[PDB]
Design a protein around this motif. Structure first.
Motif, PDB file in Angstrom:
ATOM      1  N   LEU A  95     -32.205 -14.241 -30.858  1.00 29.65           N
ATOM      2  CA  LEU A  95     -32.317 -15.165 -29.737  1.00 29.65           C
ATOM      3  C   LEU A  95     -33.630 -15.846 -29.573  1.00 29.65           C
ATOM      4  CD1 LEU A  95     -29.447 -13.720 -28.745  1.00 29.65           C
ATOM      5  CD2 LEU A  95     -31.075 -11.972 -28.920  1.00 29.65           C
ATOM      6  N   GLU A  96     -34.097 -16.658 -30.477  1.00 34.95           N
ATOM      7  CA  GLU A  96     -34.899 -17.954 -30.346  1.00 34.95           C
ATOM      8  C   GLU A  96     -35.810 -17.799 -31.744  1.00 34.95           C
ATOM      9  OE1 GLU A  96     -35.396 -19.892 -26.361  1.00 34.95           O
ATOM     10  OE2 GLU A  96     -36.378 -18.096 -26.513  1.00 34.95           O
ATOM     11  N   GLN A  97     -35.533 -16.501 -32.439  1.00 37.14           N
ATOM     12  CA  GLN A  97     -36.149 -16.683 -33.864  1.00 37.14           C
ATOM     13  C   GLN A  97     -35.072 -16.226 -34.507  1.00 37.14           C
ATOM     14  OE1 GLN A  97     -39.539 -17.907 -32.205  1.00 37.14           O
ATOM     15  NE2 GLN A  97     -39.365 -17.254 -34.592  1.00 37.14           N
TER      16      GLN A  97
ATOM     17  N   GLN B 104     -36.082 -17.769 -52.381  1.00 40.05           N
ATOM     18  CA  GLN B 104     -34.846 -17.996 -51.511  1.00 40.05           C
ATOM     19  C   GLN B 104     -34.786 -19.311 -50.968  1.00 40.05           C
ATOM     20  OE1 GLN B 104     -36.451 -14.656 -52.407  1.00 40.05           O
ATOM     21  NE2 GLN B 104     -34.391 -14.269 -51.762  1.00 40.05           N
ATOM     22  N   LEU B 105     -33.856 -20.086 -50.591  1.00 40.81           N
ATOM     23  CA  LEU B 105     -33.983 -21.183 -49.614  1.00 40.81           C
ATOM     24  C   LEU B 105     -33.147 -20.895 -48.390  1.00 40.81           C
ATOM     25  CD1 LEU B 105     -34.288 -23.908 -52.331  1.00 40.81           C
ATOM     26  CD2 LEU B 105     -35.036 -24.350 -50.008  1.00 40.81           C
ATOM     27  N   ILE B 106     -33.641 -21.267 -47.360  1.00 43.56           N
ATOM     28  CA  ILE B 106     -32.816 -21.320 -45.939  1.00 43.56           C
ATOM     29  C   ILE B 106     -32.910 -22.700 -45.331  1.00 43.56           C
ATOM     30  CG2 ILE B 106     -32.787 -18.941 -45.625  1.00 43.56           C
ATOM     31  CD1 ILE B 106     -34.835 -19.141 -43.278  1.00 43.56           C
ATOM     32  N   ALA B 107     -31.933 -23.034 -44.594  1.00 42.79           N
ATOM     33  CA  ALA B 107     -32.126 -24.082 -43.562  1.00 42.79           C
ATOM     34  C   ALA B 107     -31.472 -23.562 -42.301  1.00 42.79           C
ATOM     35  CB  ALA B 107     -31.089 -25.425 -43.692  1.00 42.79           C
ATOM     36  N   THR B 108     -31.962 -24.325 -41.064  1.00 41.75           N
ATOM     37  CA  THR B 108     -31.974 -24.122 -39.659  1.00 41.75           C
ATOM     38  C   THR B 108     -30.995 -25.106 -38.953  1.00 41.75           C
ATOM     39  OG1 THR B 108     -34.213 -24.829 -39.370  1.00 41.75           O
ATOM     40  CG2 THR B 108     -33.944 -22.335 -39.498  1.00 41.75           C
ATOM     41  N   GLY B 109     -29.875 -24.437 -38.712  1.00 40.81           N
ATOM     42  CA  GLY B 109     -29.056 -24.702 -37.355  1.00 40.81           C
ATOM     43  C   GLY B 109     -29.866 -24.299 -36.369  1.00 40.81           C
ATOM     44  N   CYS B 110     -30.174 -25.250 -35.449  1.00 42.61           N
ATOM     45  CA  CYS B 110     -30.902 -24.687 -34.358  1.00 42.61           C
ATOM     46  C   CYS B 110     -31.044 -26.013 -33.061  1.00 42.61           C
ATOM     47  CB  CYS B 110     -32.784 -24.720 -34.870  1.00 42.61           C
ATOM     48  SG  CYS B 110     -33.877 -24.348 -33.618  1.00 42.61           S
ATOM     49  N   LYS B 111     -31.586 -25.343 -31.979  1.00 36.30           N
ATOM     50  CA  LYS B 111     -31.175 -26.019 -30.843  1.00 36.30           C
ATOM     51  C   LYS B 111     -32.338 -27.303 -30.606  1.00 36.30           C
ATOM     52  CE  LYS B 111     -30.417 -24.656 -25.838  1.00 36.30           C
ATOM     53  NZ  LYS B 111     -30.398 -23.569 -24.580  1.00 36.30           N
ATOM     54  N   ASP B 112     -33.263 -27.289 -31.220  1.00 37.18           N
ATOM     55  CA  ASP B 112     -34.314 -28.452 -31.041  1.00 37.18           C
ATOM     56  C   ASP B 112     -33.906 -29.790 -31.444  1.00 37.18           C
ATOM     57  OD1 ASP B 112     -34.640 -27.918 -33.697  1.00 37.18           O
ATOM     58  OD2 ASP B 112     -36.669 -27.534 -33.476  1.00 37.18           O
TER      59      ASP B 112
ATOM     60  N   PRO C 220     -41.289 -19.847 -38.510  1.00 39.34           N
ATOM     61  CA  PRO C 220     -42.231 -20.855 -37.592  1.00 39.34           C
ATOM     62  C   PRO C 220     -41.543 -22.150 -37.145  1.00 39.34           C
ATOM     63  CG  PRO C 220     -43.038 -20.124 -39.685  1.00 39.34           C
ATOM     64  CD  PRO C 220     -41.528 -19.880 -39.909  1.00 39.34           C
ATOM     65  N   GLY C 221     -41.976 -22.708 -36.257  1.00 37.19           N
ATOM     66  CA  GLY C 221     -41.843 -23.906 -35.397  1.00 37.19           C
ATOM     67  C   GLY C 221     -40.565 -23.869 -34.453  1.00 37.19           C
ATOM     68  N   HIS C 222     -39.772 -22.794 -34.300  1.00 39.08           N
ATOM     69  CA  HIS C 222     -38.491 -22.711 -33.792  1.00 39.08           C
ATOM     70  C   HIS C 222     -38.944 -21.760 -32.318  1.00 39.08           C
ATOM     71  CE1 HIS C 222     -36.240 -23.401 -37.563  1.00 39.08           C
ATOM     72  NE2 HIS C 222     -36.406 -24.528 -37.172  1.00 39.08           N
ATOM     73  N   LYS C 223     -38.373 -22.454 -31.136  1.00 39.23           N
ATOM     74  CA  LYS C 223     -38.473 -21.813 -29.957  1.00 39.23           C
ATOM     75  C   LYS C 223     -37.016 -21.707 -29.323  1.00 39.23           C
ATOM     76  CE  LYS C 223     -38.559 -25.951 -28.248  1.00 39.23           C
ATOM     77  NZ  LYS C 223     -38.873 -26.819 -29.629  1.00 39.23           N
ATOM     78  N   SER C 224     -36.354 -22.077 -29.934  1.00 39.63           N
ATOM     79  CA  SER C 224     -34.881 -22.383 -29.270  1.00 39.63           C
ATOM     80  C   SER C 224     -33.883 -21.644 -29.914  1.00 39.63           C
ATOM     81  CB  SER C 224     -34.629 -23.993 -29.044  1.00 39.63           C
ATOM     82  OG  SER C 224     -34.888 -24.667 -30.084  1.00 39.63           O
ATOM     83  N   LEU C 225     -32.838 -21.292 -29.478  1.00 31.59           N
ATOM     84  CA  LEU C 225     -31.865 -20.817 -30.227  1.00 31.59           C
ATOM     85  C   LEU C 225     -31.110 -21.380 -31.465  1.00 31.59           C
ATOM     86  CD1 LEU C 225     -29.303 -19.806 -27.009  1.00 31.59           C
ATOM     87  CD2 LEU C 225     -30.636 -18.171 -28.391  1.00 31.59           C
ATOM     88  N   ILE C 226     -30.816 -20.330 -32.496  1.00 30.50           N
ATOM     89  CA  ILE C 226     -30.446 -20.878 -33.836  1.00 30.50           C
ATOM     90  C   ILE C 226     -28.900 -20.487 -33.940  1.00 30.50           C
ATOM     91  CG2 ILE C 226     -31.060 -20.124 -36.135  1.00 30.50           C
ATOM     92  CD1 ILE C 226     -33.553 -20.345 -34.689  1.00 30.50           C
TER      93      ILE C 226
END
Lengths: 307, 670, 238
Positions: free
Chosen positions: A188-190, A229-237, A209-215
């Motif tokens: 919930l936000e990380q 590894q790689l990731i990307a962020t679906g994220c609410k910002d 880092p740099g996320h304060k909102s829901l993922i």
């Protein structure tokens, strides 16, 4: 394009493929898991099995590692992960082709997502919802698959308040077996990265880092063709932050953040990835699927704009 | 690159509505599925990825490319004898470039005939127009000047016309040559459309500006001496060299001779016409101010200095500029500005752009330009090929073949995994990765679905990779209920301990009544003697032999020994039991497995019980765990015929159990 | 026959109805020359002169004992005239066939050796040798009579007879012998691995005057090799 009928009357929450890609276990909230099948002379997809699963809405679904029978489970808010196994004498289009094996009541409180652990770790699944705990049940025996031996209970928030069923619980796995398991798990936000210890418990190696909102989605970019590894962020910002997680409470990872996208101009809700992870397939609130693809420097530029 | 998600039911195209559009990219990529997780669209859109469409013309295209790389070896770097071996290895890399683009002309010869998006075929026009200029500037010459191979300068100069513009089609021999308001011509355009098509370097549409119009009906009729040196004008176009620039110099003197033989001779013809005749002739001497002003585009002017002035590369610095004092360079579409980037030199920052002009063309462009070493890398010295540690070549080549796997198909794996076993840099690390990773969603219940992957482990042979495959399908089969080719795949997992548990039980705890049938597997019961003809044994011992073959001296004395399960006799199924027991499980599957094989006729009446009988060929030829077993080592499981004989139906010793009752009846019994 | 063919073209431009160059056109074009010298009949309404010119060059150099260079020279002639055209031979007729028979009867043992990958312990583990027994029986009970002059009404030649005698001799008892090796290395004793006749039943099945496998067969040199395997067929019941 032509949109195939599902028979469903209620939102497609997920679509998850098997390794063939020729079956998708599409869940709706119409209490059926209508598993489809690609007949390869048509693009439209037709039924394989309309069995009624859970009696609470299947809010995510994940194909299983189908080692011991062809298995598909799902977690719904009835606090179960019901496994459903196909023996190969079962038949299609009939309401019985995937049949109940277990009923997970070890897990407490409402669930929202199983992800199966890879088949090198046998029949092991993680599970998380507002249980607030990442609970790694493990059915150790190859015959007896109801034998749910706990390995690691790792607290996500201990009990999330109920308004976090509006929160995507994001769960993803590296399918490499030449490394110990890694999984970004949304608290919930990380999204705390549960990296393996050595001690029989995971620990939080990093937190995005740099996320304060829901993922709103993590899909783990395969550890095919990368030692890292790689990731990307679906994220609410309103953004995509594409962390190349180079290998460096225990840790062995360091965060780099290379490209940062934002041309979705509103929330990103699908991060998906190519099966090997080449194609950053990113769908948002702009109504345009923006397939992104790395060019030389490993920096993702948009390859195609499917309006 | 626009693709409608749908032409029916549309989820969003707009950032006015914040709905959660989700798209799932799987192991297909000609159907990916686009939907909303809102109470709107439960519809699912079958949606392709551009440049990742399952097609069979595609399968010919990507097979063709892949075998052209095999002629260039696993080689991808430039080598330095060394005063001609830095030119020789260059020389063969010219000719494979032309194999690439002529595969592509065979594949333009496919996708011109029927295109489902006209822009999918325009990708093959525009990436080929980049790699038309590449072929004129570098890849036939040895990365040198025009004068090295002048004819083949000229042939790619014709490819630069015929495969950018869809031409020949007659329309430039018809323009004022079949229709202003003449039919015997004094018009500028009777001769500018001769000039520009010669400036093009083309000679199939340039002859039609001679022959199907006016050369006779005014020149010969006016005068016979305004006709004796207009004769010389086209004669100079015909005795133009095509295959050398040495003769070209003597020909440039001969232009100064007989272009000045019309200067000296009569004029009884129009001053329009005369001066147009001179304008064609100042193409032919190669004068500056007529190489510009009758060009239709920049690459006719730039390529009119390059022919008919000095056929050497040096009219590309100061003179390219004079082709921008001709015609602009297009930048609304990207096909002509990448061409400029060749002429300046940098084919490494336009390879990026050729990814969306079709990456399949661009991947093998990257392969072969690194073999010349005109593209750079930006980091050199994880051995993996999706780092830019690795080649610009192996950036696009073996990352092309990873998305083949995701394409839809996985029988283009003889191609794909065939790609990633080649390259100077060790992509043997990668060969582990694409073939170790498929776990969470693969290992299915089947008869056989891993057999072929041993052939996807001779596109490179690593033995460690060759049993990992059957680990992820060699204990996955105990619910599939297929027979002995699964006992095959258990052994070939790598293990002798997975045939100590999953085929051991077809010899122990085998019973549920009087008959010893109990076996999910169907080659125990009706097809017991099916592996005994060596007809069903053979598939499994030719895809790694010795790991399967040795375990068949256990499950094919199982057509002799095991026939006692079917009916219990004193001989016939005592013939074919008390025979061989001492090689067949004494280095292979468990050693004293014998308690629901040999034992289980001890209680039934055949033998001493309350009365002295004796059973043929078992009197003293059963002697292991079956007689004495209080001192002798028995792998324990004898409880299943000491209360599982009320279903067999013995009585006279089925009461008052002893394991030394079994020790008595095999001692005295006479 | 390419350079030689252009040689024939030149000599027809230099006239005459017959040349010494047109003599060899149904001789040559030495192994290769003979076999590539004949090919000339494909078209209808004559093929009764074909087997004559076959056996007249096949035999010609057969001092190399080559029957392996007659695996495309006994099949070079086509009966085509289906729709594409719209005693003389009796002696030789069987010889056409029996050239190629020798190779096949080698290859009638060897192919079972490659196509097994299981123990050959008898109890009906291999059952793929029953039909093969009956097949490999006809190569000494195969009723034709191998490679020899058979009549004296047709054309024969004596120089070309001794290289029938000996080429016959080299291979015909081998094919015979590999039938008898299957008795004690494939364990198929009859048409089932039980009963040992069909080695004792073969002791005057080798003897026949309908295939004439008797008259060329040594009374100590081939007969001693033959009976020692019978004596090992006998000890499968001793």
């Amino acid at each position: 394009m032509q949109p195939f009928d599902s028979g469903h009357d209620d939102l497609v929450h997920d679509v998850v493929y098997d390794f063939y890609g020729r079956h998708v276990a599409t869940c709706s909230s119409d209490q059926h898991i209508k598993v489809f099948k690609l007949d390869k002379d048509t693009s439209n997809w037709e039924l394989s099995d309309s069995w009624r699963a859970h009696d609470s809405s299947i809010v995510a679904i994940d194909w299983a590692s189908p080692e011991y029978g062809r298995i598909i489970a799902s977690a719904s808010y009835d606090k179960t992960v019901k496994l459903w196994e196909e023996d190969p004498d079962q038949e299609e289009c009939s309401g019985r082709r995937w049949n109940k094996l277990c009923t997970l009541n070890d897990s407490k409180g409402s669930l929202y997502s199983v992800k199966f652990a890879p088949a090198h770790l046998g029949l092991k699944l993680a599970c998380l919802g507002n249980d607030g705990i990442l609970r790694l049940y493990d059915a150790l025996e190859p015959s007896d698959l109801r034998s749910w031996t706990l390995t690691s209970e790792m607290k996500v928030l201990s009990i999330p308040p109920a308004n976090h069923l509006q929160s995507d619980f994001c769960l993803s796995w590296c399918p490499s077996r030449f490394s110990p398991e890694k999984l970004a798990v949304s608290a919930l936000e990380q999204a705390i990265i549960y990296q393996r210890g050595k001690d029989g418990k995971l620990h939080v190696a990093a937190k995005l880092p740099g996320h304060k909102s829901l993922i709103r989605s993590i899909s783990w970019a395969p550890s095919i063709g990368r030692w890292y590894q790689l990731i990307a962020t679906g994220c609410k910002d309103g953004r995509i932050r594409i962390f190349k997680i180079t290998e460096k409470l225990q840790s062995n990872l360091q965060v780099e953040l290379l490209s940062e996208h934002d041309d979705h101009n509103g929330e990103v809700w699908s991060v998906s990835w190519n099966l090997t992870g080449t194609i950053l397939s990113s769908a948002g609130d702009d109504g345009k699927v923006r397939l992104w693809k790395a060019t030389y420097s490993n920096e993702f530029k948009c390859m195609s704009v499917i309006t | 690159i626009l693709v409608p998600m749908t032409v029916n039911d549309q989820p969003i195209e707009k950032n006015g509505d914040k709905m959660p559009l989700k798209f799932k990219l799987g192991p297909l990529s000609y159907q990916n599925m686009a939907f909303i997780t809102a109470k709107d669209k439960y519809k699912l859109y079958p949606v392709r990825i551009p440049r990742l469409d399952t097609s069979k013309e595609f399968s010919a295209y990507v097979s063709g490319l892949f075998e052209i790389y095999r002629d260039l070896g696993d080689d991808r770097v430039f080598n330095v004898v060394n005063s001609n071996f830095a030119k020789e290895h260059n020389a063969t890399v010219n000719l494979a470039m032309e194999a690439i683009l002529n595969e592509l002309e065979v594949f333009i010869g496919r996708v011109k005939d029927q295109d489902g998006r006209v822009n999918r075929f325009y990708e093959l026009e525009e990436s080929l127009t980049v790699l038309n200029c590449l072929r004129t500037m570098y890849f036939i010459l040895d990365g040198q000047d025009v004068e090295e191979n002048r004819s083949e300068f000229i042939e790619s100069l014709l490819n630069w016309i015929n495969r950018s513009d869809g031409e020949p089609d007659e329309e430039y021999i018809e323009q004022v040559f079949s229709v202003a308001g003449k039919k015997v011509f004094e018009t500028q355009y009777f001769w500018k459309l001769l000039n520009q098509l010669v400036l093009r370097g083309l000679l199939s549409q340039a002859i039609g500006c001679i022959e199907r119009s006016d050369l006779l009906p005014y020149l010969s009729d006016t005068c016979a001496v305004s006709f004796d040196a207009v004769s010389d004008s086209i004669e100079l176009l015909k005795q133009y060299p095509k295959d050398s620039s040495s003769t070209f110099r003597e020909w440039k003197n001969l232009v100064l001779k007989l272009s000045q033989a019309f200067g000296s001779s009569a004029t009884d013809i129009s001053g329009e016409l005369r001066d147009y005749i001179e304008d064609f002739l100042l193409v032919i001497g190669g004068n500056q101010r007529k190489i510009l002003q009758y060009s239709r585009t920049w690459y006719e002017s730039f390529c009119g200095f390059l022919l008919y002035y000095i056929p050497s590369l040096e009219l590309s610095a100061e003179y390219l500029q004079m082709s921008l004092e001709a015609n602009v360079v297009d930048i609304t579409n990207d096909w002509e500005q990448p061409c400029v980037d060749i002429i300046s030199g940098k084919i490494h920052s336009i390879l990026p752009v050729m990814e969306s002009l079709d990456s399949c063309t661009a991947a093998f462009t990257a392969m072969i330009c690194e073999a010349k070493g005109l593209i750079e890398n930006i980091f050199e010295g994880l051995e993996d090929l999706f780092s830019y540690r690795n080649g610009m070549a192996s950036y696009m080549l073996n990352s092309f073949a990873f998305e083949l796997c995701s394409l839809g198909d996985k029988e283009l794996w003889p191609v794909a995994i065939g790609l990633i076993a080649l390259s100077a840099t060790g992509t043997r690390s990668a060969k582990k990765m694409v073939i170790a990773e498929l776990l969470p969603h693969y290992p299915f219940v089947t008869n056989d679905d891993i057999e072929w992957m041993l052939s996807i482990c001779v596109e490179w042979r690593l033995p460690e990779i060759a049993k990992e495959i059957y680990t992820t399908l060699g204990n996955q089969m105990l619910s599939a209920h297929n027979i002995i080719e699964s006992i095959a795949n258990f052994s070939r997992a790598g293990k002798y301990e997975l045939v100590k548990s999953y085929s051991w039980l077809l010899f122990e705890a085998s019973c549920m009544e009087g008959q010893k049938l109990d076996d999910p597997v169907l080659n125990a019961i009706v097809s017991k003697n099916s592996p005994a003809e060596d007809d069903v044994i053979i598939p499994q011992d030719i895809l790694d032999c010795v790991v399967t073959n040795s375990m068949r001296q256990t499950l094919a004395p199982y057509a002799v020994l095991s026939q006692f399960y079917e009916l219990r006799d004193r001989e016939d199924w005592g013939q074919a039991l008390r025979l061989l027991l001492l090689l067949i499980e004494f280095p292979y599957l468990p050693k004293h497995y014998l308690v629901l094989l040999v034992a289980k006729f001890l209680y039934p009446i055949f033998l001493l019980d309350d009365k002295k009988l004796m059973d043929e060929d078992s009197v003293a030829t059963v002697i292991e765990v079956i007689e004495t077993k209080w001192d002798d080592a028995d792998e324990k499981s004898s409880n299943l015929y000491e209360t599982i004989i009320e279903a067999d139906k013995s009585l006279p010793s089925s009461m008052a159990t002893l394991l030394k009752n079994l020790r008595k009846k095999l001692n005295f019994k006479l | 026959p390419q350079v030689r063919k252009k040689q024939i073209e030149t000599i027809n431009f230099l006239r005459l109805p017959a040349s010494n160059i047109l003599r060899r056109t149904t001789q040559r074009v030495i192994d290769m020359h003979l076999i590539y010298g004949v090919e000339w009949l494909i078209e209808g309404k004559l093929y009764v002169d074909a087997v004559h010119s076959i056996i007249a060059l096949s035999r010609r150099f057969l001092l190399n004992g080559r029957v392996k260079a007659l695996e495309q020279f006994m099949e070079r002639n086509n009966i085509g005239e289906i729709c594409k055209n719209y005693e003389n031979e009796d002696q030789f007729l069987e010889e056409i066939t029996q050239y190629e028979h020798l190779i096949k009867g080698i290859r009638e043992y060897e192919e079972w050796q490659k196509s097994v990958s299981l123990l050959s312990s008898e109890s009906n583990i291999p059952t793929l040798i029953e039909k093969l027994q009956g097949f490999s029986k006809d190569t000494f009970e195969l009723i034709k009579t191998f490679l020899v002059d058979l009549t004296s009404s047709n054309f024969a030649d004596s120089a070309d007879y001794e290289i029938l005698y000996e080429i016959r001799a080299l291979y015909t008892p081998f094919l015979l012998m590999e039938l008898h090796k299957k008795l004690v290395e494939a364990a198929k004793l009859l048409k089932i691995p039980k009963f040992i006749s069909e080695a004792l039943a073969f002791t005057s099945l080798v003897a026949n005057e309908n295939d004439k496998i008797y008259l060329l067969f040594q009374s100590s040199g081939k007969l001693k090799e033959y009976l020692d395997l019978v004596a090992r067929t006998a000890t499968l019941s001793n």
